[PDB]
């Protein structure tokens, strides 16, 4: 599975390590993120994610 990050404040989404605090398991797709998640550091929304590739 693919890393993703925010491009507003550089948060890296790591889908090893999930983000529990707020509900997302180790494991989980980015993809399958609930729509309604926050970047946990800046408060964005998903859609100022992308793919690190
Ligand atoms: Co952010």
Redesign the pocket.
């Known amino acids: 599975m693919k890393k993703y990050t925010?491009?507003?404040?550089?948060?890296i989404y790591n889908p090893e390590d999930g983000d529990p605090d707020n509900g997302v398991n180790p494991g989980t797709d980015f993809k399958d993120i609930p729509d309604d998640w926050?970047?946990?550091?800046?408060?964005?929304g998903k859609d100022?994610f992308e793919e690190v590739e």
């Open positions: 925010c491009t507003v404040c550089g948060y926050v970047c946990p550091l800046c408060g964005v100022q």
